[PDB]
Amino acid sequence: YKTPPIKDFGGFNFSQILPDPSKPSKRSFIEDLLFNKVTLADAGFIK
Amino acid sequence: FQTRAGCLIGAEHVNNSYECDIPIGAGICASYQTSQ
Numbered sequence: 582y583k584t585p586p587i588k589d590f591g592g593f594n595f596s597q598i599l600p601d602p603s604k605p606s607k608r609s610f611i612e613d614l615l616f617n618k619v620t621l622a623d624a625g626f627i628k
Numbered sequence: 629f630q631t632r633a634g635c636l637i638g639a640e641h642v643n644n645s646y647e648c649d650i651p652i653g654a655g656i657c658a659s660y661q662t663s664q
């Protein structure tokens with residue numbers, strides 16, 4: 582499912598959790614925050 | 629055909645996307661289809 586372009590959610594704002602098309606990865610703002618706040622290791626993409 | 633998991637040999641890469649049949653890694657899946 583994909584949210585409609587219009588966001589008339591009775592005044593509720595879900596911008597910070599819905600996908601952000603600007604970024605290449607379609608993660609939302611909070612998802613990006615979490616990913617940056619976790620430091621991973623050994624991605625394994627042919628190092 | 630190079631993939632994130634590694635080199636895939638003997639299989640043909642197709643633009644089209646279907647349901648995963650045989651997982652490989654990094655979102656790549658292989659399946660037997662049409663000749664065949």
Ligand SMILES: *[C@@H]1O[C@H](CO)[C@@H](O[C@@H]2O[C@H](CO)[C@@H](O[C@@H]3O[C@H](CO)[C@@H](O)[C@H](O[C@H]4O[C@H](CO)[C@@H](O)[C@H](O)[C@@H]4O)[C@@H]3O)[C@H](O)[C@H]2NC(C)=O)[C@H](O)[C@H]1NC(C)=O
Nearest residue numbers: 586587588589590592593594595596597598599601603610
């Ligand atoms: C629903 O979602 C959010 C909830 O608040 C809100 O929309 C945006 O919220 C952010 C708050 O972080 C606003 O960002 C700020 O806006 C001021 C005034 O315009 C600007 O100074 C900044 O925006 C700029 O930020 C960067 C430049 O510094 C660039 O990304 C760009 O140039 C921005 O213009 C500051 O960050 C933002 O203004 C609002 N925008 C809108 C359209 O609301 C609002 O409650 C609801 N927004 C939507 C789209 O539904």
Ligand SMILES: *[C@@H]1O[C@H](CO)[C@@H](O)[C@H](O)[C@H]1NC(C)=O
Nearest residue numbers: 629639640641642643644645
């Ligand atoms: C798959 O996408 C690429 C990029 O457009 C394209 O060049 C290629 O032709 C496509 N695969 C086939 C078999 O057409």
